[PDB]
Amino acid sequence: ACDYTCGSNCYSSSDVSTAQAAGYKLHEDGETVGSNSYPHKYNNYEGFDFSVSSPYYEWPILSSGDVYSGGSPGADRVVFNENNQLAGVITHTGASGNNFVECT
Numbered sequence: 001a002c003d004y005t006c007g008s009n010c011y012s013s014s015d016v017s018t019a020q021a022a023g024y025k026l027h028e029d030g031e032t033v034g035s036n037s038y039p040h041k042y043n044n045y046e047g048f049d050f051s052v053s054s055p056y057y058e059w060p061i062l063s064s065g066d067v068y069s070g071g072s073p074g075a076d077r078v079v080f081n082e083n084n085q086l087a088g089v090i091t092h093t094g095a096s097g098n099n100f101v102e103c104t
């Protein structure tokens with residue numbers, strides 16, 4: 001079973017923590033990857049009720065199991081805060097435009 005299901009993408013907790021760690025490291029070093037400069041601030045326009053405090057940052061999580069290194073980020077993201085605490089896993093899949101919905 002999946003720990004997080006983003007549309008048809010299935011992620012385990014291990015997939016998430018691996019993605020989060022890579023994203024947080026870049027954040028810590030003040031470096032970005034890709035045309036959209038990941039990781040970057042996640043404004044939470046959606047108003048998700050995250051249990052940890054902001055600011056939030058988003059980093060792509062890939063269904064391939066690889067760590068994001070550039071190119072297309074797909075539709076899924078892991079959201080972490082300044083303390084490297086996991087806020088949530090979100091996706092563009094099933095949401096209109098560039099909006100997000102939470103992975104289940």
Ligand SMILES: Nc1nc2c(ncn2[C@@H]2O[C@H](CO)[C@@H](O)[C@H]2OP(=O)(O)O)c(=O)[nH]1
Nearest residue numbers: 036041042043044045046058077098099100
């Ligand atoms: N939908 C959405 N996009 C956000 C948010 N915070 C930052 N963004 C970024 O703001 C723009 C419009 O949604 C996009 O550049 C999106 O990038 P990502 O695809 O990298 O999330 C947010 O809270 N919601």
Ligand SMILES: [Ca+2]
Nearest residue numbers: 011012015065
């Ligand atoms: Ca996996």
